[PDB]
Each structure stands twice: as C-alpha cells, then as structure tokens.
Amino acid sequence: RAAAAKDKWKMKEWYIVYAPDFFGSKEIGLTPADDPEKVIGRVIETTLKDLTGDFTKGHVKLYFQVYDVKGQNAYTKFKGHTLARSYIRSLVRRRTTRVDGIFNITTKDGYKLRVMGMVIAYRRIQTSQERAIRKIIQDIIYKKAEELNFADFVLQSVNGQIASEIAKEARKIYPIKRAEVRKIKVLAEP
Amino acid sequence: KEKWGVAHIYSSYNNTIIHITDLTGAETISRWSGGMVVKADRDEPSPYAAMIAARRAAEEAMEKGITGVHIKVRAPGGSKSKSPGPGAQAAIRALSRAGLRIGRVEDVTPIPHDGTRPKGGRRGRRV
RNA sequence: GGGUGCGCAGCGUAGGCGGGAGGCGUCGAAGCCCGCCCUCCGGGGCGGGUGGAGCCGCCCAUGAGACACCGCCCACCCUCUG
RNA sequence: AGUGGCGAAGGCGCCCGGCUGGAACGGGUCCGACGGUGAGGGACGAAGGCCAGGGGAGCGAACCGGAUUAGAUACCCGGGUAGUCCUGGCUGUAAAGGAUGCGGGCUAGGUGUCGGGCGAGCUUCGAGCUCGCCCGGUGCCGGAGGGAAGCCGUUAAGCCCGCCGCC
C-alpha cells in the first residue's frame, strides 16, 4: 500500500552537511535519513567554484565523506578529487603526446595518498623525453610531500601551483600546454 | 529552503530508466521506466515514453519537496554499446519543463581501459 | 491515551446504538493570516493570530440523520508506564 | 597510436628497477680476403590439439532449450562443458602471402616520413622550431625500359656475374 510508504517518507528527517576545517565550513547540501547512523558513510560530490566561486575552476570535482554527526548537523572529511571527463577529452588530441605519472606519497603528518599527474606536449615526441618528464614530476611531488602536509598539499594541488612548477621545469625538455594534477586518492590515516 | 537532487538516466536501445535520488545517491525518491507507461515492448525507448516517465518522476519529486536537480546520463557501457539511446534528451527536456531547476550535466558511461571480450563470436551477428 | 470513518443520490466522511429538540457565543463564533501530523493530499481533525456576535438542526432526501448534544464500540499505523 | 618502430621469421603496446641480443650513424682506430650459396644434418616456429600438475572472472566448440521455416540437425535469443590463463614437456602445421629465394655491380628523377651526422638562420635559450646536404631504413607517384595483359618501374617483375630449391 501507500500508507506505509508515506509513513516511511514522513519519518525521515533532514540533516545539513558541512565541509571540513582547512576548507571553509560550508553548507554543501541536505540529506534525508530515519536514523543518525545510516548517514555515517556518504559521499557528497561538489565542485571547487561552488565553495570559492572562481569562475574558471569549475572542472574540478571534490568528494567529501561523512564521518560524524551532532544533532542535525553532519561534518565531512576529504577523500579525493579528480578532473572532469570533458576537460580531459578536449585536452588529449591527435598529433600530440600525453605523459601520465602515478605515485604513492606520505606527507609530513603520516597521511598516505595516491597522486596522478598529467602532462601534454605540442608534438609527437620520443619516449626518452617522456621518461625525463616523468622523472621531473616524480621529484617535484616527492619534494612537496616531504615539505608540506595534507591541507596545503591539497589546496596547492587544486589551485594550480604544483602544476605551474611542473610545467616550468619540464619546459626544459620540450614545451608544454596544460600541465595539471589530475587525481588524488586518500588511502590511509595514522 | 531549496533542495537539490540527482537524476540518473540509464538509456539503451531497448528501454530508458529515470531515477531521482538525493545528492548522496543513498536515499531514493522516485523511479520510473518506459515499461510502466506503455504496453508494446517496441516502444519502451520512444522519446515520448521517456517524456512521460520523466514527468511522473519529476512531479513525485516535487511533491516530496525537491526543487533543483543535477543530471548524470548513462549508457550500459563496458563491453556493450557506448552510445546512449534517443530517450535521454527527451527525458532531460521533460524534466526541465516539469518545473525543476537544472544544474550540472555529465555523462557517466563506464569505459574499459582494456577489458573483457564481447559477445559477437569473432564474426559478430549475421542476422 | 493522541490521532483515525466519500455503501449510493451528497449542502457531505449521514458509521452504529439509548437518551438528545434542543445546542451553544466573555465556561468570548464567525468571516479574514499565515503553519506540523492522519489519512481514498478525499477533505476535514489541529495550533498562535485583524477579528467582536452568529451558526447547527425539528425544516427535504436515506432503510436505518445529522460532525443537533450527551455515554460506548469499532480499521489501522503510533506515544508512557507496570 | 601513426600511412609509425624493433625483430630471421612467427610475432612484440601500463609504469619503475635489474640482466641480456642485434642494427644504423660518426671514425687518417685494429686484423688483413678471413667471402657467397648451401645437398645431407640442425635450431626457432600463430591458432588449435595431447601428457602431467594448478587455476577458472568474461567468452564460449559439443550439449540442452525458445523461435523462424514446407522442414531447419543453421543463421537470431537465453543458458553451458572442454578450451582460452600460469609451470614443465610433446605435436611441427596455415591465404606461415610482398602468393615475389639469397649475395654483388650497372640503367632519369620527384615528393613524404623515421634514425643518426654536418651547415645556416630563429628563439620563450628548451633533449626546442624552420630550411638545405650525406648515409641508412620504410612508403606514394612517375619518364625511358619490360611484360599476355593487370601492372612492375634504382625497395624491378630491366641488362650482367654466381649458387641452392622447385615445375
């Protein structure tokens, strides 16, 4: 019947989701649930402009996971981020070269991450140059990891500083268009 | 207050499914298929059938209190086809007209970096 | 205990008994303003508020008549105790 | 991701590290004809199949069901066993095809691309861009010339010097 259905829908309460502290604690959205603990473990997908409205960084997607509740207010943690399909496809064209590196990182605070960085060149280049560029990416990311910690790592990786450094130092082997950091996953926590 | 949901569309050469959830995708609100609104199996993916199911789902969502909606459109993918059917755009326009506000739109057709073997038989279908 | 009733034709959810032509309005109401719950969202039952003095029915239908007022049941899904 | 590259051929595409084979370029470096082909003999050799041991997601011979059909031991649909995968061995086959045996000298060139080297100009000073030349690989056009023709044409299916296999 529809009686129990309406009963179920009307027994459901709403909760307000909140971003973490090294971001700005915002009001991403709302979640229904009957009980409080059916909400522990839930992934909100948003973009970076919604948080801080820079009109250009609309292609970045962040994923926040629910881990705690206090009344009708839930608080999140950072889980990972990835670029957008449309952006990546518009980038990777024919008669160019794509160079991707995937590395495992441990920050100053003991967080373990998997970072996937990407580079694009203007022409159909050799393979030794690919490998040199990959080594550059690796060195820079390891250095930034040993010198920085989670919050700054993520904020820089999403704002586009590490990408600028990567591009500037890889411009010594072959010029470059649209260097970027494409993905981060969190694997562990102390 | 303004609440947003998410519309997953599964489109094929044989049916169309519209499914509206909250932003988390863990709480379901409405679910309607092309096979609930016709009696011919050869009409389930007709964009009119898609329009109708979209309208039903949107009105139920509005009744429940949903105002905005993001959109993820999908084809089966994997080893099957990677191209959606013709009911997806119909459903999107119908959701727009029903009275909901629309946000982001994305395609989520799962694609194989390299994967399993499809069903043809090294010669495909021969009819 | 809190809530909960379109067999038809219907001013409309007449549910059924005994009494009840009589019941109320400062033991303050309408008409007008915004709101949670029940449910065939039918439609009422419910609350703070401009409001300051009318409205039900014996008057017709329906087999059993009034949400006319007093005591009691019942169909559900719910809140406390022992 | 290429009309591209390496490999005797079969064949070889995620990343980092180690061991290993061969070719080109550059070279007033070393030996000093040590070379070519190769009967008989040997080594490699897709898929499928066999032996022995493990594993088993998807696909799927055989098999079983539903339809289509005059019938349908098939095409279409739903399921499914060996097999496809790893270790250690056998079998020795294909449109294994450039359907074109290997080496050497000669008989117009043009235009692309891959690697290396040289010389000029640009530069954001980049293992970077452009233009030209020599060597080697790999393609598309084409004149004499050749051929039954289709077509080949300095990567000959042309004229010469050789060896083996075959009709």
Swiss-Prot record, chain A:
GO CC term, one of those recorded: cytosol
Entry's transmembrane regions: none
Assembly and oligomerization: Part of the 30S ribosomal subunit.
Family the UniProt entry places it in: Belongs to the eukaryotic ribosomal protein eS1 family.
UniProt keyword terms in alphabetical order: Ribonucleoprotein, Ribosomal protein
Gene Ontology MF, one: structural constituent of ribosome
PANTHER family reported for this sequence: 40S RIBOSOMAL PROTEIN S3A
Protein name stated in the entry: Small ribosomal subunit protein eS1
Keyword hit for Ribonucleoprotein: yes
Keyword Mitochondrion tagged: no
GO BP annotations listed: translation
UniProtKB/Swiss-Prot annotation, chain B:
GO BP: translation
Signal peptide: none
Keywords for this protein: Ribonucleoprotein, Ribosomal protein, RNA-binding, rRNA-binding
Annotated GO MF terms: rRNA binding; structural constituent of ribosome
Pfam families assigned: Ribosomal_S11 (PF00411)
SUPFAM superfamilies documented for this protein: Translational machinery components
InterPro entries attached to this UniProt entry: Ribosomal_uS11 (IPR001971), Ribosomal_uS11_archaeal (IPR019961), Ribosomal_uS11_CS (IPR018102), Ribosomal_uS11_sf (IPR036967)
Region feature Disordered, mapped onto this chain: 103-127
GO CC terms in record: cytosolic small ribosomal subunit
Role: Located on the platform of the 30S subunit.
HAMAP family: Ribosomal_uS11 (MF_01310)
Quaternary structure note: Part of the 30S ribosomal subunit.
Record-stated family: Belongs to the universal ribosomal protein uS11 family.
Name of the protein in question: Small ribosomal subunit protein uS11
Lineage: Archaea, Methanobacteriati, Methanobacteriota, Thermococci, Thermococcales
Gene: rps11
